[PDB]
Design a protein around this ligand. Structure first.
Ligand SMILES: Nc1nc2c(ncn2[C@@H]2O[C@H](COP(=O)(O)OP(=O)(O)OP(=O)(O)O)[C@@H](O)[C@H]2O)c(=O)[nH]1
Ligand SMILES: Nc1nc2c(ncn2[C@@H]2O[C@H](COP(=O)(O)OP(=O)(O)O)[C@@H](O)[C@H]2O)c(=O)[nH]1
Ligand SMILES: [Mg+2]
Lengths: 66, 439, 426
C-alpha cells in the first residue's frame, strides 16, 4: 500500500512537470516560427523594392544610351 | 494566506480593474491613500482583505495586482487617477505601441517586448505572498492586447507557476461597442490558446450588460463606465468569499463543482438586483425576488438560453441580510415554478453561500444600494450558443480570408486560424456530448 | 507620441496640404506663428500627432516637395508659410513638365535623396512614428511620378510604418495635361503596391458638386480645394482629437479587407449661400453622408457594395440618435453591404465640430463601386495608348511601353477584384 501511495504522488509530480515542459516547448516553437515568418515577409518586401530600384537605374541607362 | 494576484491586460482589463479595486476599497474601508482605519494591525495581518490587499509599515493597503497595457493612455489615467496613491508605480506597466487590434501583434510582435517585464512584476508580487492561491486575469477577447498578450501571459504563468490557479474575466465582444471588424478572429484565437491554461473562465457579454443598464438602470446609451461599474459588482460578489469571511463559502468549492470536465470551465453568471436609486426607494427586495431574478434570462451576463440546454451545476452566492431559511424557501419556490433541468450525471442541488457583508455602490453610481444581492453561477450547456455566434462570424470572414493578411504579416499562419476554429468546433461538440443523457 | 510625418509634393499636393495645415491649426488653436491660443485642452492633447513642440511653437511636421519652386514659394507666401519649418522646404528647379516618368526616374530621382534626408530627420524626432501621409495629384509630374518614387524609397527605410496617400484623381472636366491619364495610371500602379490606405479624391466629382450643389458655374481650384480640405479634416478628426480608428494602423486593419483594395471613397455632409438654419437633423446628416452627391469620389455607392465603411460625426449630438441612424441605413440598405464581413460599418462621434458647422458627417468607405473611377482612367489610357499618343515622351526618359501595359493590367486587375468581391456571397 505504501509503494502505491508513493507512486501516485510521483505520478502527479511527473504530470505537472510534463505540462510545464510541453507548454514551454510549444511557446518556443511558435515564437521562432512567427519570427522567421515575419522577417521573411520584410525581406521579400525589401527585395521587391530593390528590384524596382534596379529597373529605375536601367531606365536611366536607356535614356543615356539615346 | 491564500493571496490572489490580479492581472489586468488591455484597456478593458485595466478599466474594469479600476472599477473593481475602487469597489473593493469601499467595501473594505480602505481609503484612497490606502490607509484602512478599521485595520489595527499595521504592516501585516491575516485578515480576509489581505488576500487581495497587501499592507505596509505606514498602514497603507496596496492592491495585489498589476496593470499591463501596451499603450500608456489607459494606465496613465490610473497613474493620475484618484486611486493613483493606492497603486504602486511598478504595478502599472505600459509600453508605447498597441497591437492595433491584432492578436498577432499583441502575442508576438509587441507582447514579446513587455512579456518578460510583466512576469517580472508578477513574480515580485508572488514573493510577497505567503501562500499564493492563483491569478485573476481580466481581459477582452476583441483587442490585440486583450487577446494576444493575454494568451502569452497565460502560457508564461503556466510554465513559471506550474499548475497554480488561473481564473479569468473575458469580455465577450458586443457589436454595439465593437471597435474592430476582426474581433471575432482575435476571440477564436485567444479562446483556443488559453483554453488549456485557464482553470475557470467567466465571460461577460457587453451586449448583455449594455441591455441590463438600459433596462434596469434606464440609461439611454450606457457607457463603458456603466458597464464597468455593473461588472465590478458581479466580480465583487464572486470574490467576496475571498476578501471577506459563517455562511460564506470559498469559491474553490464552487469551482470544484462548476468544472465537471476540464474544457467545460465557462460558468454562466446572473446577478440581482440591478435597480435604480429611485426604483429602489420604497421597494424592498426579498430573497425570493432576487432569487427569481437569478433565474431570469434577461439578468444573465452572457446572452444565451439556459432552457435550450441543461444545468451541470448551479450555485448561488448571496451577500447581505440573508438567512438560510429564506434562501431555502425561495429555492423551493423557484423549483416549483422553473424548469431547472440537470444532466443525469449531476446532482440537482443548489450550492449556496451567504456573506452577511452587505453590498456597496460607488458614489454617483446608477446602482441603488440594496440590503441584499445575489449572483448565481451556473454550468449550463447553453453557453455554447455564445461560441456559435462568434464562431459563425469567424467562419464568415475566414472563408474569404479577410483581414487574414494582417495576421500573416506579423508571422502567424493560416494553420493557426484553422486549428483554433477546429478546437472551437470540438468545444461545441463537447457541450453537446455532456448534455446527452447517460445510456 | 504617435507622430505622423506629413509630406506634400506637387502643385496640387502643396496647395491641398497648405489648406489642411491651416485648418487643423485653427482646430487645434495654433496660428501661423506656431503660438497656441485655444480654449480647449483637447486641441493640444494630440497636437503631437501632426505637430512638433518648440516658445511653445507647434510646428507642422511637414515636408514640402515640388520640382518647381514657384509653387512652394507661393506656399511660403500664403498664411502659415512661416509656421512650416524652412528646412522642410525642398524644391528643385527643372520641374517635371507634367511627366510621371520625369519625377519617378529623372528629375524626381535627383531631388528624392534630399527629401528622404528631411524625412529621416522628422522620423528620428518622432517618438512612435505611425507612418507617412502624402498629399499629391496623380495627373501632374512631381506629385505623381516623384510622389510614388518617394513612397517606394520611404517604404524601404520604414517597411513597418503605415503609408497613407490622399491621391487626387485627374478629371477630363478639369482637363489640364492631355497625357494625364498615363500619369494617373502610373501612379495608381505604384499606389496599388506601395500604399497601405489611399483616399480617392476625384477632381471630377469635386467639380460636379460645385457646379451643381454649390451652384458654381465656374468651379475654381480654390472651390475644389475647400471640399478636399473639409474631407481631409473629417478623415483626420479621429487622428487629431481624443477611439474608432484612432491611429492609421487600426483604421486600416478594420477597413482593408484585402491589400489591393486600399482605395476608398471619401464623403462629407452637409455640402449654397442659402444658410437654411435648422442644424441638419442627424437623420439627414446620415442620409447625406451616404448620399452619392456627398461622395468626393466619382462613383455611385448604389452601383456597388460596401466592403467596410467608417463614419465620423463632429458636433455635439445625441450619440443614441446617431447609433440608430447608422443601424437604420445599414438595415434598409443591406444589399449594399457585403454579408461575408460582419459589422463592416463603424461610427464615431466627436464633440468639436468643423469651423462654422454645428455638426458634420464624414464618410470613408471601401465600396466595390470604386472600380468605376479606375475604369474611367483605364479607358482614357487605352484610347491614348492605342495610338501611342505622347508615348515618345516617356520613352525619351528610357521608359518602355510594357511599363504602360503592366500599369494598365494592374488597374484592370484591381477593378476585377473589386467586382469579384462585390459579386461574392456566403
Ligand atoms: N465591458 C467593457 N468592454 C470594454 C471596455 N473597454 C474596452 N472594451 C471592449 O474591448 C474591445 C476592445 O478591446 P480593448 O481593451 O480596447 O483592446 P486592447 O486591449 O487595448 O488592444 P489594442 O487593439 O492593441 O489597443 C471592444 O470590443 C470593447 O467592447 C470596458 O471598459 N468595459
Ligand atoms: N482639386 C485640385 N486639383 C488640382 C489643384 N492643383 C492641381 N490640381 C490637379 O493637378 C493635376 C496636375 O498635377 P500638378 O499639380 O501640376 O502636379 P506637378 O507636376 O507635380 O506640379 C491636374 O489634373 C489638376 O487637376 C488644386 O489646387 N485643387
Ligand atoms: Mg488600447
Amino acid at each position: 500500500k505504501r509503494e502505491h501511495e508513493r507512486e501516485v504522488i510521483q505520478k502527479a509530480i511527473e504530470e505537472n512537470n510534463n505540462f510545464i515542459k510541453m507548454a514551454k516547448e510549444k511557446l518556443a516553437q511558435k515564437m521562432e516560427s512567427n519570427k522567421e515568418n515575419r522577417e521573411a515577409h520584410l525581406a521579400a518586401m525589401l527585395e521587391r523594392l530593390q528590384e524596382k530600384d534596379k529597373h529605375a537605374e536601367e531606365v536611366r541607362k536607356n535614356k543615356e544610351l539615346k | 494566506m491564500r493571496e490572489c494576484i490580479s492581472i489586468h491586460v488591455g484597456q478593458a482589463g485595466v478599466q474594469i480593474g479600476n472599477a473593481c479595486w475602487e469597489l473593493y476599497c469601499l467595501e473594505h474601508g480602505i481609503q484612497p491613500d490606502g490607509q484602512m482605519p478599521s485595520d489595527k494591525t499595521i504592516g501585516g495581518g491575516d485578515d480576509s482583505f489581505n488576500t487581495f490587499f497587501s499592507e505596509t509599515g505606514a498602514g497603507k493597503h496596496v492592491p495585489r495586482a498589476v496593470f499591463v497595457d501596451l499603450e500608456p493612455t489607459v494606465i496613465d489615467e490610473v497613474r493620475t487617477g484618484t486611486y493613483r496613491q493606492l497603486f504602486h508605480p511598478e504595478q502599472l506597466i505600459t509600453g508605447k505601441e498597441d497591437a492595433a487590434n491584432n492578436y498577432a501583434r499583441g502575442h508576438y510582435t509587441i507582447g514579446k517586448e513587455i512579456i518578460d517585464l510583466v512576469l517580472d512584476r508578477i513574480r515580485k508580487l508572488a514573493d510577497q505572498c505567503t501562500g499564493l492561491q492563483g491569478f485573476l486575469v481580466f481581459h477582452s477577447f476583441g483587442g490585440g492586447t486583450g487577446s494576444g498578450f493575454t494568451s502569452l501571459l497565460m502560457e508564461r504563468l503556466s510554465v513559471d507557476y506550474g499548475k497554480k490557479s488561473k481564473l479569468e474575466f473575458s469580455i465577450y465582444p458586443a457589436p454595439q461597442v465593437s471597435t474592430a471588424v476582426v474581433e471575432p478572429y482575435n476571440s477564436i484565437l485567444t479562446t483556443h490558446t488559453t483554453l488549456e491554461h485557464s482553470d475557470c473562465a467567466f465571460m461577460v457579454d457587453n451586449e448583455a450588460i449594455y441591455d441590463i443598464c438600459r433596462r434596469n438602470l434606464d440609461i439611454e446609451r450606457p457607457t463603458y463606465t456603466n458597464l464597468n461599474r455593473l461588472i465590478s459588482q458581479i466580480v465583487s460578489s464572486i470574490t467576496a468569499s475571498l476578501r471577506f469571511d459563517a455562511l460564506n463559502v470559498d469559491l474553490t468549492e464552487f469551482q470544484t463543482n462548476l468544472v465537471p470536465y476540464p474544457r467545460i470551465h465557462f460558468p454562466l453568471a446572473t446577478y440581482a438586483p440591478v435597480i435604480s436609486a429611485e426604483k429602489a426607494y420604497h421597494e424592498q427586495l426579498s430573497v425570493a425576488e432576487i432569487t427569481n431574478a437569478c433565474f431570469e434570462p434577461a439578468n444573465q451576463m452572457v446572452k444565451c438560453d439556459p432552457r435550450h440546454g441543461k444545468y451541470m451545476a448551479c450555485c448561488l452566492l448571496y451577500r447581505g441580510d440573508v438567512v438560510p431559511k429564506d434562501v431555502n424557501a425561495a429555492i423551493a419556490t423557484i423549483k416549483t415554478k422553473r424548469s431547472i433541468q440537470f444532466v443525469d450525471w449531476c446532482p440537482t442541488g443548489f450550492k449556496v453561500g451567504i456573506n452577511y457583508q452587505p453590498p456597496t455602490v460607488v458614489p454617483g453610481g446608477d446602482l441603488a444600494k440594496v440590503q441584499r444581492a445575489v449572483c448565481m453561477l451556473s454550468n449550463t450547456t447553453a453557453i455554447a450558443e455564445a461560441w456559435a455566434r462568434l464562431d459563425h462570424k469567424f467562419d464568415l470572414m475566414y472563408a474569404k480570408r479577410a483581414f487574414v493578411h494582417w495576421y500573416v504579416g506579423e508571422g502567424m499562419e493560416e494553420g493557426e486560424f484553422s486549428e483554433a476554429r477546429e478546437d472551437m468546433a470540438a468545444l461545441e461538440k463537447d457541450y453537446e456530448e455532456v448534455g446527452v443523457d447517460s445510456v | 507620441m504617435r507622430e505622423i510625418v506629413h509630406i506634400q509634393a506637387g502643385q496640387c499636393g502643396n496647395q491641398i496640404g497648405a489648406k489642411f495645415w491651416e485648418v487643423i491649426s485653427d482646430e487645434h488653436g495654433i496660428d501661423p506663428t506656431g503660438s497656441y491660443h485655444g480654449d480647449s485642452d483637447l486641441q493640444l492633447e494630440r497636437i503631437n500627432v501632426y505637430y512638433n513642440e518648440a516658445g511653445n511653437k507647434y510646428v507642422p511636421r511637414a515636408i514640402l516637395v515640388d520640382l518647381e519652386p514657384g509653387t512652394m514659394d507661393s506656399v511660403r507666401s500664403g498664411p502659415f508659410g512661416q509656421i512650416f519649418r524652412p528646412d522642410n522646404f525642398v524644391f528643385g528647379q527643372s520641374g517635371a513638365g507634367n511627366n510621371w516618368a520625369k519625377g519617378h526616374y529623372t528629375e524626381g530621382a535627383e531631388l528624392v535623396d534630399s527629401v528622404l534626408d528631411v524625412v529621416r530627420k522628422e522620423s528620428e524626432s518622432c517618438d512612435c512614428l505611425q507612418g507617412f501621409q502624402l498629399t499629391h495629384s496623380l495627373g501632374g509630374g512631381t506629385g505623381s511620378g516623384m510622389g510614388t518614387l518617394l513612397i517606394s524609397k520611404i517604404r524601404e527605410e520604414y517597411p513597418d510604418r503605415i503609408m497613407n496617400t490622399f491621391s487626387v484623381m485627374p478629371s477630363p472636366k478639369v482637363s489640364d495635361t492631355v497625357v494625364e491619364p498615363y500619369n494617373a495610371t502610373l501612379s495608381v500602379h505604384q499606389l496599388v503596391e506601395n500604399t497601405d490606405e489611399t483616399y480617392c479624391i476625384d477632381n471630377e466629382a469635386l467639380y460636379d458638386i460645385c457646379f451643381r450643389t454649390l451652384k458654381l458655374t465656374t468651379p475654381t481650384y480654390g472651390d475644389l480645394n475647400h471640399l478636399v480640405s473639409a474631407t481631409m479634416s473629417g478623415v483626420t478628426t479621429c487622428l487629431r482629437f481624443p477611439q474608432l480608428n484612432a491611429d492609421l494602423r487600426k483604421l486600416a486593419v478594420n477597413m482593408v479587407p484585402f491589400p489591393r483594395l486600399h482605395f476608398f471613397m471619401p464623403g462629407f455632409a452637409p455640402l449654397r449661400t442659402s444658410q437654411q438654419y435648422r442644424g441638419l437633423t442627424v437623420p439627414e446628416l446620415t442620409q447625406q453622408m451616404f448620399d452619392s452627391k456627398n461622395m468626393m469620389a466619382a462613383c455611385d455607392p448604389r452601383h456597388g457594395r460596401y466592403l467596410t465603411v467608417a463614419a465620423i460625426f463632429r458636433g455635439r449630438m445625441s450619440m443614441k440618435e446617431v447609433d440608430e441612424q447608422m443601424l437604420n441605413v445599414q438595415n434598409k440598405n443591406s444589399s449594399y453591404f457585403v454579408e461575408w464581413i460582419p459589422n463592416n460599418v463603424k461610427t464615431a462621434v466627436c464633440d468639436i465640430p468643423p469651423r462654422g458647422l454645428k455638426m458634420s458627417a464624414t464618410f470613408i468607405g471601401n465600396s466595390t463601386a470604386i472600380q468605376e473611377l479606375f475604369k474611367r482612367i483605364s479607358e482614357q489610357f487605352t484610347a491614348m495608348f492605342r495610338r501611342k499618343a505622347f508615348l515618345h515622351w516617356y520613352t525619351g526618359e528610357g521608359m518602355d511601353e510594357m511599363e504602360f501595359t503592366e500599369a494598365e493590367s494592374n488597374m484592370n486587375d484591381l477593378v476585377s477584384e473589386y467586382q469579384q468581391y462585390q459579386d461574392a456571397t456566403a
